[PDB]
């Protein structure tokens, strides 16, 4: 029944709005200029950063590259909490074995972080601090190794992904499908996850058929993006393994350590 599939799509969209404060809609409204409120403060170099460090930050002894990296860590932690709340709204999720819920999040959250970062990005930079800051791609890419190469891959994906022109309604279901991946390592009860995902995939297919009538390729392209994201996150984790090993001033946030731990 397509009726139930549209109701499911709407439920996920509504939960998505509850769980994620800065939506792609609200982000694109800021990136362009729909709003009249104080545009975000633009950070494009060391000088712009030091003065904006009060409009983006709601110590001061660590170098810039480290400070910005810690910032990315704090946002990702907040995002993990948002994603966890969203996951719990997906029909069937909370009824899964609790250990499997943890496993699904452990392997899923960073794929979702990449996905949702794109919503806050254009070719030129990323919105931060709930939209009150805008840090340029060029500034982030210029951060000393290895940190510049840690930032850039997120923009590389966002450019490709944003070309697909998904909206928040599309994204709500896309994210749900990713979280309910029955082939994450170490899952105990695969069938119930696969059954939920199969229904979510049907919901996604119908959503894209109705919402993007003129782009028949979209569903198949999103399935491949789910595959790409696994390789993309593997690289993220590795590069982060190198950072915690090579930078003596790396306080890896406990939640992130917990997620990265034994991620293979």
């Amino acid at each position: 029944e397509s009726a139930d599939l549209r109701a499911l799509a709407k439920h996920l969209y509504d939960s998505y709005i509850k769980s994620f404060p800065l939506t792609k809609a609200k982000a694109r409204a800021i990136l362009t200029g729909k709003t009249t409120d104080k545009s975000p403060f633009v950070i494009y170099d060391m000088n712009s950063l030091m003065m904006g460090e009060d409009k983006i930050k709601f110590e001061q002894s660590k170098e810039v590259a480290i400070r910005i990296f810690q910032g990315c860590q704090f946002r990702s932690v907040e995002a993990v909490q948002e994603i966890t709340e969203y996951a719990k709204s997906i029909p069937g999720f909370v009824n899964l074995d609790l250990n499997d819920q943890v496993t699904l999040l452990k392997y899923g959250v960073h794929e979702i972080i990449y996905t949702m970062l794109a919503s806050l990005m254009n070719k030129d930079g990323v919105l931060i601090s709930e939209g009150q800051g805008f840090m340029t791609r060029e500034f982030l890419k210029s951060l000393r190794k290895p940190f510049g190469d840690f930032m850039e891959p997120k923009f590389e994906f966002a450019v490709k992904f944003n070309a697909l022109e998904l909206d928040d309604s599309d994204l709500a279901i896309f994210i749900a499908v990713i979280i309910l991946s029955g082939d994450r390592p170490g899952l105990l009860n695969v069938k119930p996850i696969e059954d939920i995902q199969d229904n979510l995939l049907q919901a996604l297919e119908l959503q894209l058929k109705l919402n993007h009538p003129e782009s028949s390729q979209l569903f198949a392209k999103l399935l491949q993006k789910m595959t790409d994201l696994r390789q993309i996150v593997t690289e993220h984790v590795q590069l982060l393994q190198v950072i915690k090993k090579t930078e003596t001033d790396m306080s890896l946030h406990p939640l992130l350590q917990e997620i990265y731990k034994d991620l293979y």
Binding site: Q81, L98, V102, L255, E258
Partner: peptide
Amino acid sequence: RHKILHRLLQE
């Protein structure tokens, strides 16, 4: 492991 995720998952 996963002390934090566990408590986040349980309201």
